[PDB]
């Protein structure tokens, strides 16, 4: 049952936007806290591997890491969202028939989640960035703003997708793949 | 009136996600139906000329074949959706002042319909694809995942919009025509 | 404290359609108007410089020019947006924690601007498009429709940026900065 205060690990402030939107009535930034009240607790750290460590430790000092879900995003009842796992889910993100959102995972403003996907643990998602039917995103992987996998694609763990970029083609290994930047005329 | 079930026939969870939003109670899937109880009917093939030929034969078999239409979706008052013709809206499409929206179209999670635009029927428009003012999207077209389509153009009927591509200039020749591809680094 | 009516000088019925679901109950539309009843005004036009000049007359003639903002847009409590100033704000637009929204800008169907962006007076930002963290857009700048630009960028005063297009780097001289074209295939 959510606490009416969060502890809340720029993003800082979003975050709170969002817990506020839920109806929590007070946030507190931490930037031993084991001795403090047990508020439900969350990690507003862009990085993968921070979020990670932070999570993992938070986790053993004794707090619930909620999932912080904005009012607005809509997520198919089939879906499957891991329960209090520190996602993030910002305005207006659409996640389709049994998707899967892992723990860990940032689903930013205005991306969509086809159904059948999977989101692989800590990743990042980006604003407008979007997956097709059946795709599968490994472990840390970053899809940058306004891109997207086409349908039935896997990307593998730790992959980066640039800025504006279109996935077409599946991927088995890492990987650094980019799109066209804006060129001055 | 929309009756209180639906029959529908990865999308159909999806059309029965929009279906349920709507306040439908029940859906049925199907994949002599004339026999049936007249409950409204949908079909939910991301295929444009088997959504037709299905379309065509469930209308001569007596059945209403309804709009399903997402309550997040947003329609101006002056624009035309064509009643009870098959037509998908997906979450959070937005649809401006006076457009027209045809029998059997496809408007995917997010896409953009600016004024006076008209999409043609059966045709297809992708998640985040956006059609600027006054665009004509002709018969049986597919727009991809977050394209787009500049002011004042047409694209002739049978054409193909790829993934992350932005159309420039006039067609009125059906055609096939491509973004870039995300590349390795 | 907001009229029932707005006189607003396409696009005139698009912000009408905003007007109205922001509660006004009926829309004037202009194309000596001083001795008019002053209901709140708005300037439909989507030029820069003719909404700027129209906006220094019709401020000398005693009105009010109002702000437009769909019900669906979220903005941040800690965002600023200048109050009554012409300001356009379309369906699902998306403004983040201490942005900076100025005096005349558009901000289009679906665009977001991410925390402490600044935008500067009398830009226009389409359908789409999106500015990571902490970008400042100089004042009459225009982002085309699905255009982006990457955290801590700035756009100088003036510059263009088209459909489709990332930007990557400071730009701190005016320019117009374009993206890929579809292909026919
Ligand atoms: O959970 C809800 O409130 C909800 C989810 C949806 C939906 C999700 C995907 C398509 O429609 N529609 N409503
Ligand atoms: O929305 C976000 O979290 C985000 C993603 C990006 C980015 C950087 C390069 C490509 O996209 N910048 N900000
Ligand atoms: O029909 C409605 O409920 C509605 C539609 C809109 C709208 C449509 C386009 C811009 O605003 N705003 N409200
Ligand atoms: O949202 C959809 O229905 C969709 C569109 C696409 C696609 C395939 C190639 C370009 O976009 N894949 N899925
Ligand atoms: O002002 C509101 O009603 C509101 C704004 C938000 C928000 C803004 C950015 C992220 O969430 N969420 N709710
Ligand atoms: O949404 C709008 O106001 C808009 C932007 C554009 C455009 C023209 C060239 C690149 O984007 N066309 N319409």
């Known amino acids: 049952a959510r606490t009416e205060k969060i502890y809340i690990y720029g993003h800082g402030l979003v975050c709170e936007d969002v817990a506020k939107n839920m109806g929590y009535k007070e946030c507190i930034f931490l930037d031993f806290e084991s001795t403090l009240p047990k508020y439900d607790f969350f990690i507003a750290i862009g990085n993968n591997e921070i979020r990670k460590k932070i999570y993992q430790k938070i986790?053993?000092?004794?707090?619930?890491i909620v999932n912080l879900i904005h009012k607005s995003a809509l997520i198919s009842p089939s879906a499957i969202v891991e329960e209090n796992a520190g996602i993030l889910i910002m305005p207006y993100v659409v996640i389709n028939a049994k998707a899967k959102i892992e723990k860990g995972v940032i689903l930013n403003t205005s991306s969509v989640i086809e159904h059948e996907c999977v989101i692989g643990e800590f990743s990042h998602v980006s604003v407008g960035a979007k997956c097709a039917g059946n795709v599968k995103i490994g472990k840390n992987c970053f899809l940058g703003i306004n891109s997207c996998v086409l349908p039935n694609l896997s990307l593998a763990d730790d992959?980066?997708?640039?800025?504006?970029a279109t996935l077409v083609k599946n991927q088995?290994?890492?990987?650094?793949?980019?799109?066209?930047?804006?060129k001055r005329m």
């Open 59 to 64: 986790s053993e000092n004794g707090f619930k």
């Open 159 to 164: 992959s980066i997708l640039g800025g504006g």
């Open 172 to 182: 088995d290994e890492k990987g650094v793949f980019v799109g066209v930047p804006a």
